[PDB]
Motif scaffolding. Structure first.
Motif, PDB file in Angstrom:
ATOM      1  N   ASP A 240       0.899  -1.127   0.000  1.00 31.19           N
ATOM      2  CA  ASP A 240       0.000   0.000   0.000  1.00 31.19           C
ATOM      3  C   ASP A 240       0.946   1.187   0.000  1.00 31.19           C
ATOM      4  OD1 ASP A 240      -1.863   2.090   0.464  1.00 31.19           O
ATOM      5  OD2 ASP A 240      -2.376   1.417   2.473  1.00 31.19           O
ATOM      6  N   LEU A 241       0.922   1.967  -1.069  1.00 29.52           N
ATOM      7  CA  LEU A 241       1.823   3.111  -1.129  1.00 29.52           C
ATOM      8  C   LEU A 241       1.094   4.436  -1.034  1.00 29.52           C
ATOM      9  CD1 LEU A 241       4.085   1.684  -3.980  1.00 29.52           C
ATOM     10  CD2 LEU A 241       4.612   1.547  -1.513  1.00 29.52           C
ATOM     11  N   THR A 242      -0.107   4.416  -0.465  1.00 31.84           N
ATOM     12  CA  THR A 242      -0.855   5.660  -0.324  1.00 31.84           C
ATOM     13  C   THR A 242      -0.564   6.314   1.020  1.00 31.84           C
ATOM     14  OG1 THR A 242      -2.875   4.589   0.573  1.00 31.84           O
ATOM     15  CG2 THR A 242      -2.772   4.922  -1.831  1.00 31.84           C
ATOM     16  N   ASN A 243      -0.535   7.638   1.019  1.00 33.51           N
ATOM     17  CA  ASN A 243      -0.307   8.441   2.218  1.00 33.51           C
ATOM     18  C   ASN A 243       0.862   7.962   3.076  1.00 33.51           C
ATOM     19  OD1 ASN A 243      -1.289  10.892   3.286  1.00 33.51           O
ATOM     20  ND2 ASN A 243      -2.338   9.814   4.955  1.00 33.51           N
ATOM     21  N   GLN A 244       2.007   7.829   2.431  1.00 33.00           N
ATOM     22  CA  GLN A 244       3.207   7.372   3.102  1.00 33.00           C
ATOM     23  C   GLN A 244       4.030   8.531   3.646  1.00 33.00           C
ATOM     24  OE1 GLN A 244       4.060   3.849   3.405  1.00 33.00           O
ATOM     25  NE2 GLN A 244       1.833   4.097   3.136  1.00 33.00           N
ATOM     26  N   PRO A 251       1.486  11.511  -2.126  1.00 29.78           N
ATOM     27  CA  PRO A 251       0.467  10.757  -1.382  1.00 29.78           C
ATOM     28  C   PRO A 251      -0.390   9.726  -2.079  1.00 29.78           C
ATOM     29  CG  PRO A 251      -0.143  13.039  -1.533  1.00 29.78           C
ATOM     30  CD  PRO A 251       1.263  12.966  -2.001  1.00 29.78           C
ATOM     31  N   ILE A 252      -0.563   9.823  -3.398  1.00 29.98           N
ATOM     32  CA  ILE A 252      -1.383   8.825  -4.102  1.00 29.98           C
ATOM     33  C   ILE A 252      -0.514   8.051  -5.074  1.00 29.98           C
ATOM     34  CG2 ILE A 252      -3.686   8.405  -5.013  1.00 29.98           C
ATOM     35  CD1 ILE A 252      -4.488  11.212  -4.696  1.00 29.98           C
ATOM     36  N   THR A 253       0.303   7.160  -4.537  1.00 31.70           N
ATOM     37  CA  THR A 253       1.212   6.382  -5.353  1.00 31.70           C
ATOM     38  C   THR A 253       0.756   4.938  -5.349  1.00 31.70           C
ATOM     39  OG1 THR A 253       3.026   7.896  -4.882  1.00 31.70           O
ATOM     40  CG2 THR A 253       3.669   5.688  -5.514  1.00 31.70           C
ATOM     41  N   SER A 254       1.177   4.164  -6.350  1.00 30.57           N
ATOM     42  CA  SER A 254       0.800   2.757  -6.410  1.00 30.57           C
ATOM     43  C   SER A 254       1.654   2.020  -7.411  1.00 30.57           C
ATOM     44  CB  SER A 254      -0.686   2.614  -6.819  1.00 30.57           C
ATOM     45  OG  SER A 254      -1.068   1.246  -6.879  1.00 30.57           O
TER      46      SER A 254
END
Length: 321
Positions: A240-244, A251-254
């Protein structure tokens, strides 16, 4: 030379198409990729109508085992908010997660709303109504985007939730990442979520976002990569790469996945699919970066190669890699 067919996610379609074109030129092998959305890609691979499926939303280990599937990540992209606001330039507007959720909830209806103005002090925002655009099809990009909103907006989390398809409070539906890009382009006042390449390639303006750490950050290949710096890939590919947390972490990565069957009935097809992806890992990095997708660390591709050896076989138990 072989002919392969894949179907699924539009999130990484620009890079899969570029890799396919180059691979054909260098080796003669043909890879036809159909961007039908992650949900469709999953249905297709399970129906066995394609050689490989593609989905940005990962399947759980239990779901993979039940279907006899193996999943592996390819590249890292980022989701941005493309906007069509007259007189505003790309990268000028800043939004935070809370406010973005209130826009999608229908709580905020005009571009000069106080909540937006306070986030953008030097800006002269227009009193233009906001036209919200979202996906009409089952989408891995929707999955990533709603996964993010549920973390930063409690009302979103409680009332609409997360998923590849949800009951959207408001907004017009666009088909595929390309569909959302076309809508924003044609609708003054529109906001729509798309994988970065789609905004850049169509010359759409986009916003900055406030990171998990509290800083405004721009969507760039490096910032997508930054969001992934703390993922423990050794534990699982389904990150899960969101809000890291972290400096310049978009913030919205994937990342995004390819699904293939573990028991290959057509081993020749299976072998060629692995060769194409191996080639992409070995030589396709420059093309992925040209399209602003970050590459997976070498340690991760080595893990993928190791897993191919153990998991992919023909009906006789013979490994295909």
């Amino acid at each position: 030379e072989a002919s392969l067919t894949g179907a699924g996610a539009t999130f990484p379609a620009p890079v899969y198409a570029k890799w396919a074109d180059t691979y054909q030129k260098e080796t003669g092998n043909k890879v036809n990729y159909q961007g039908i959305g992650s949900s469709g890609g999953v249905k297709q691979i399970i129906a066995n109508t394609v050689d490989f499926g593609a989905s940005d939303a990962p399947l759980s280990d239990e779901k993979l085992a039940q279907e006899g599937l193996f999943q592996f990540p390819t590249v890292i992209g980022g989701v941005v908010l493309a906007v069509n606001i007259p007189g505003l330039k790309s990268g000028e507007l800043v939004l935070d997660g809370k406010t973005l959720g209130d826009i999608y909830l229908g709580k905020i209806k005009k571009w000069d709303d106080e909540a937006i103005a306070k986030l953008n002090p030097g800006l002269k925002l227009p009193s233009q109504n906001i036209a919200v655009v979202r996906r009409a099809d089952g989408s891995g990009t929707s999955f990533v985007f709603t996964s993010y909103l549920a973390k930063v907006n409690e009302e979103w989390k409680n009332n609409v939730g997360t998923g590849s398809t949800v009951k959207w409070p408001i907004g017009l539906g666009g088909k595929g990442n390309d569909g959302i890009a076309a809508f924003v382009q044609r609708l003054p006042g529109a906001i729509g979520y798309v994988e970065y390449a789609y905004a850049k390639q169509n010359n759409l303006a986009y916003t900055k976002l406030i990171s998990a750490d509290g800083k405004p950050v721009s969507p760039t290949e490096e910032n997508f990569a930054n969001a992934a710096k703390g993922a423990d890939w050794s534990k699982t590919f389904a990150q899960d790469l969101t809000n890291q947390k972290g400096e310049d972490a978009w913030p919205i990565t994937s990342t995004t996945f390819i699904l293939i069957h573990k028991d290959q009935k057509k081993p020749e097809q299976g072998t060629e699919v692995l060769k194409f992806f191996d080639w992409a890992y070995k030589t396709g990095a420059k093309q992925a970066n040209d399209l602003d997708y970050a590459s997976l660390p070498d340690s991760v591709v080595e893990q993928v190669r190791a897993a191919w050896k153990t998991n992919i076989k023909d009906s006789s138990g013979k490994p295909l890699y």
